[model samples]
Target: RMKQIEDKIEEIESKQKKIENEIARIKKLLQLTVWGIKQLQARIL
Candidate 1:
């Protein structure tokens, strides 16, 4: 039972890392999109 718990914890940690990386990537993309929109607005003005 203890081994099973340890294994689950490791698996969860690995998944957490993947989720965090995805979140970081999504945030970067959002920032880039926002910057692009601002640049377009400036050009239009």
Candidate 2:
């Protein structure tokens, strides 16, 4: 039973790492989008 619990914990930890990486990727994309919008506004003005 203890071994099973340990295995589950490891699985959760791995999934958590993947989620963190995905969040970072999304943040970067958002930053890029914001920059693009600013450039567009500047050009229009």
Best by TM-score: 2
Off by over 4 Å in 1: none
How many residue pairs clash in all the candidates, one count each?
Answer: 0, 0
Q: TM-score for candidate 2, please give it.
A: 0.96
Candidate 2 segments exceeding 4 Å error? none
Task: Spell out the clash pairs found in candidate 1.
Answer: none
lDDT of 2 by residue, 1-45 (tens): 999999999999999999999999999999999999999999999
What is residue 37's positional error in candidate 1, in angstroms?
0.3
List TM-score per model, in order. Answer: 0.93, 0.96
